[PDB]
A paper describes a structure:
We identified two virulence pili independently critical to A. baumannii catheter-associated urinary tract infections, the chaperone-usher pathway pili Abp1 and Abp2. Further, their respective tip-adhesive proteins, the adhesins Abp1D and Abp2D, make use of large, distally oriented binding pockets to adhere to glycoproteins like fibrinogen, a wound-healing protein important in CAUTI pathogenesis. We demonstrate that Abp1D and Abp2D RBDs are structurally similar, and each binds fibrinogen and other relevant host glycoproteins important in CAUTI and other infections. These proteins share a common binding mechanism, using a large, distally oriented, and flexible pocket that recognizes a complex glycan receptor.
We next inverted the side chain charge at position 86, creating R86E, to attempt to actively repel adherence. This R86E mutation abolished Abp2D binding to BSM. To assess whether the reduced-binding R86E mutation modulates the anterior loop opening dynamics, we crystallized the Abp2DRBD R86E protein, resulting in a cuboidal crystal, which was solved at 1.9 Å resolution (8 DKA). The electron density of the anterior loop is sparse, starting at position 86, even though the rest of the protein is well-modeled. This indicates that the loop is flexible and oriented in different conformations between different molecules throughout the crystal. However, we were able to model the R86E anterior loop, finding that it is displaced dramatically up and into the binding pocket by 11.6 Å relative to the structure solved for Abp2DRBD WT. Consistent with our hypothesis, the R86E mutant ensemble is characterized by a greater diversity of open and closed distances. R86E also exhibits an increase in the total number of heterogeneous conformations, indicating that this anterior binding pocket loop is destabilized by this mutation. Our findings indicate that the R86E null binding phenotype may in part be caused by the flexibility in the anterior loop in addition to the charge difference resulting from arginine to glutamate side mutation. For R86E, the electrostatic consequences of the side chain charge inversion, necessary to eliminate binding at this position, could be contributing to the flexibility of the anterior loop motif. R86E mutations in both Abp1DRBD and Abp2DRBD uniformly decrease the binding of the protein construct to each of the tested glycoproteins.
Residue numbers in the entry: 1 to 87, 89 to 166
The structure:
Amino acid sequence: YCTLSSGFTTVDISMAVGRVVVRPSDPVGKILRKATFPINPNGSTLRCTSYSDTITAALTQNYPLSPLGNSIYSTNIPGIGIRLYEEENATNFSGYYPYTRSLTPGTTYNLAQGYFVVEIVKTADQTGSGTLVPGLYSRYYVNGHMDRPFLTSTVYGNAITIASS
């Protein structure tokens, strides 16, 4: 089981990608926009007691994996996918969302330094236009503390707009 530090506070990344222009010629699979957002650790920590304890990068929108796979998930916009990941010298705790990794008992864990990456991807020949649905897109949490993640990423309002020509 994991114990969170007193005053443990989630870091939320606002996924303010902006306007993403898509051209009919853009090929399926193209990263239409790679947006990088700063992750500012804040001193929150946790430690766990069991080899079965885990930290999980989970995707909270209910959209399925896109036909392309490779962690490119569909969105409410046809032909537009989204892929998330955290970008330091810790490959065991990096990778495309979603993933889950084992934690070492007794190790005091902090939110790692780096950047949160949002990739908007063309997943079909023709793309829709509009705004990605708002809300939580990801949470990075330990087992038993899904309600208090290290890190979340959230779309507010029309922070990500697709404009297909």
